[model samples]
Structure formats: C-alpha cells, structure tokens
Target: QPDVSAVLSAYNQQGDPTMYEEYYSGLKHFIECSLDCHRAELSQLFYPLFVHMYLELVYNQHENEAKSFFEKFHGDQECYYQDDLRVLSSLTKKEHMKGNETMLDFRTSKFVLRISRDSYQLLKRHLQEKQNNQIWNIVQEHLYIDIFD
Candidate 1:
C-alpha cells in the first residue's frame, strides 16, 4: 500500500491546512469586528501572524504547505511587509531556515504591535479560548503584543 501520510507531505497539508486556515480567518474577522480604536492595530497583526504560521509550517518540514500558505496570503499582507515577504518566501525547506537572514533577524526580534488594553485583553481571551498548539506556541514565540492604556 502506498504511504498516504508520506504523500500528504508532498503538499504539506494533506489537502487541508484547516487549523491554520482557521486562525487566518478568525484573526481577520476579529479585526473586522473590532471597534475603531483597536481595528487599525489589529489589522497589523496579520503580517506577523502570517509569517509565523508559514515558519511553523516550514519548521515542521511542511515545505509545500508552507509555500502554498505563503502564496495564498502574501498578496494580502500590508505593503510595508512586502520586501520582507519576498525574503521570507525563499524559505521552502527546513534546511533553508538555517542561517537565513530572516530567521536570524526574526529569532530574537519581536513583531512589535501596540494595541489598546481592551484589544490586548480581547486577543488574550480569544487566544486562550481557541488554544490551538500551532497558533498558541507560534504566536507566543514570534509575536510581541505591547498593550497600551
């Protein structure tokens, strides 16, 4: 019998990246649903969130899915993140992650986002509730949420 599990790796998602996709959609909806004070900053979360998700996919050795995910979302990222997106898109393999500029730059770096205290709390609540390991671990590791009064 063919190894279906191995076959899934070819696409990296087994034809479904549902969980990460959920985060993508849910995060966007949260931003859209927000009141004015938080909406603008919440929108900024998309870039870092998208980047981290792609890295998590690649780091777990899901190159194809990582590529697919990156391609699907890169066009949607804000213009400011474009140059970095081009750099980030190059990482299509686990080995590619080593010594790469973006990885090193991101490793100790925080995608700094300042949002209202209320927005921060709401995000915290949402993250805590959903609690997907992929989202939880990746965001915690890669993102720095700076809450403001």
Candidate 2:
C-alpha cells in the first residue's frame, strides 16, 4: 500500500509545486489504460488539464510559455469554441484572475465565452475586408459563429 501520509498529502495540490510535473508525468498513462467506456471522460480531461496548465503557468510567471502552450494546443476548442480559448487566453497577465469569479461562475468558460457583437463586427470586417480571401473563407466555414437569433 502507498504511504498514508503521502496519500493524504496528494490531495487538492492542483496549483503547482508539483502540478506541472504532475500534468507532465500523469498524462502518459491517460490513454487506453482505462476501460473503454470511461475513456471519454478521461479524454475530456485534456481540455481542463491544459487550461489548468495555462492558468498555473501564468500564475507561476510563465506568461509567454503559457501563450505558446495555448496557441499550440488550443484547437478543437477553437474550431468549435474560438471564443473559449480566448476568454481565458486574454489573460496575458497572472493578475487577470486571482478570484476569477467569472470563470468559476460560468462553468462553461463560465459565463461569457464568446466575443461581443460589436467587436464581432469589427472582427468580421477585419477578416473579410482586410485579410486574405482564403482566410476569410476558412473563418466563414470552419469557424462558426454563435448567434442570438
């Protein structure tokens, strides 16, 4: 059996000291090792894990790397949730969210995950009028926008 104290101490330690290392090491076994039915839950972990990594890295003063990590891995979330990676990503500095009640409140990104319509229009104009046609097409097709209508 594992050491009782070590087991007791291994709890709620999600913030670091060992958090990054935990993410790094623990991921190796997150694959097919578990039952297939539970695999979906396991797979979904990748999202929160990295998001937490983003938060931890930022909190720990690794801002640039945090952005890099987000850019590199922020996909599926982007394809379907561009706004998702962003609301959380806009936090270029660690102080962005110490109490981050917004994040905790929405629980989806937690409240507002998408861009504002006014800025949304600005983005559309920038993408369509200023950017490449191909890029615009991709955004139009692959990058869907959520609507109130």
Candidate 3:
C-alpha cells in the first residue's frame, strides 16, 4: 500500500518540488534521445510532434515570454539558407522525369508538398516564360515542402 499521508505531503510541498524535478528530468532525457536518433527521412514522421511541442513552448506562453525565449535563442536578425539543390534534383529526377517529360507535373507530383500564395505566383511567372529550359530550372530551384500552405 502507498503512504497516503506522505504522498499528500509531497503534493503540498512548496513549489511542488518533487513533481517539478521529475518533469524537468524527463524533458532532458527526451531531448537527448531525440537528438541521438535524428534522420532526414524521419522528418515527415516527426513534423506533427514538433508542431505540438512548439505550440506548448511558444504559443501557450505570453507574447513577452515568447519574445524573450526567441531573443535568447535566435538573437541575430539573419536568415539561414542551405544548399538543398542536390536533394531537390534527386527527388525531381526520380519522381517527375519520364521519357520526354523532364519538368515536374505540379498537379500530380508529390515533390511539392504545399504551395503558398507567393510561391504560386512564382510558379505562374516561371510557367509563363517563353523558354522551356527556364521553367524546368525554376521548379527545381524554388520548390519546397511546407507543413502549412
């Protein structure tokens, strides 16, 4: 049997010390495990979980709290870009290039997971260009997989 009085006393302790420590330790362990098993292919599997955690840590906090946390972690007013051209080229070739069709089939292609209003405009302009070569290059360069479109 559990020690009922001791459990009640622990629950009532100042700051709920025991519960707080357990929660903090669990979060630390979870982060270590996640980093150890990271993989690009698993991104789709973990996207929803990332969103949920982000919402809990940022969206649920007050505006000031969110701002302070972001300032501490991401202070610089600079954007980061990576050369995903290789990955993009491989995906497009594997999924879209058939016999003579080198360009992606936007309507049926999984290469583009989502398209925003701005990106849609970019696509329209690219397609309207007179040269077929430019259209193919545009799709290869600007296409991305956004979680929300």
Candidate 4:
C-alpha cells in the first residue's frame, strides 16, 4: 500500500506552500490517535462525523446549538430531510412525509447526506492509518468548499 501520508503531505504542500512534512506527520499521528481512541468499528463512520463537526465548526460556530439542531431531526419527523423521506418511502413502501419549512432545506440537506454517506462508505472499506490520514487531509482541504457555497 502507498504511504497515504505522503499523499496528504503532497496535497497540503500544494495547497498551503508553507505547510511542512512535520505538520503532515503530526496530523497523521493525531488521526491515528483519534482512531485508536474511538475504536471505531467502521472507518467510513469518520466522514459523517467529520461533516457534522465541520458544519458545526464553520457554519453554526456553536457546537451545542449544532448538536441541538441535529437532534431536532430525531423528533416526530419521520425523516431528516424531505427527499430522504421521499426516497425511503419509494423504496420501502412507506408513506412520504412532508418536510417542515423551518428545518434544513431538503434540497441542500439531501446533498449533504448523500455526500456524507458516500464518503463514509468509501473510507470504511479502505480505512487504514494512512488512508485515514489522507481522508483528513481531504477534509481540511475541502472543509470550506461547500456545495452550497
């Protein structure tokens, strides 16, 4: 397997020319530590966690509020997003539930959910210390590059 750390180093070096290999190595170590601490069953799970964290960090800038915002989805509503509900209904023969106007806009929420799920699955299947490090590098590079932005 390729030294995934090298790929991350290259990307960071390309993006922020001042970034050093030491920084990349440190980041890789941090990711490895996190993985060990979490004892995550699936590597892909990190992507959704990362997305949720990034959204809370960058957009809401309020961890508690962001948490509460996500928690609201678990309420009476049958779906987190209207499209997700609709798709689920279509596939499972369940009734399609309408979405609330106050919550996350279904269009955007659907996109985020799709990307988060896809990325999570990809990472889970190929997860390793090095792969995880590269994934984090991608996350850092694209954290601000929102599809909605």
Better of 3 and 4 by lDDT: 4
Residue runs of model 3 more than 4 Å from their true location after superposition: 1-29, 38-61, 75-149
- Tens-place lDDT digits, model 1, residues 27-123: 7777788887778867878877787677767767777778777877889888887998888777778777754444644441356777888887877
Q: Candidate 2 on 1-149: residue-level lDDT in tens?
A: 33323222222122333334333334424433545543443344355445555565666667776777677667644254566676877876656755455444213222222334543454355445432333233234322244331
> TM-score for all predictions?
0.76, 0.45, 0.20, 0.20
RMSD each, Å: 8.4, 18.4, 25.6, 18.1
Off by over 4 Å in 1: 1-18, 131-133
- Residue pairs with backbone overlap in model 3: none
Among these predicted structures, which one has the highest TM-score?
A: 1
Question: Model 2: which ten-residue window has the lowest total lDDT?
Answer: 5-14
Off by over 4 Å in 4: 1-13, 35-149
Give Cα-based local distance difference scores for all models.
Answer: 0.66, 0.46, 0.29, 0.32
Tell me, by lDDT, which candidate is best.
1
Q: Rank the candidates by lDDT, best first.
A: 1, 2, 4, 3
> How are the candidates ranked when ordered by TM-score, highest leading?
1, 2, 4, 3
* TM-score, structure 3 vs. true: 0.20
Model 2 C-alpha lDDT versus the unseen true structure: 0.46
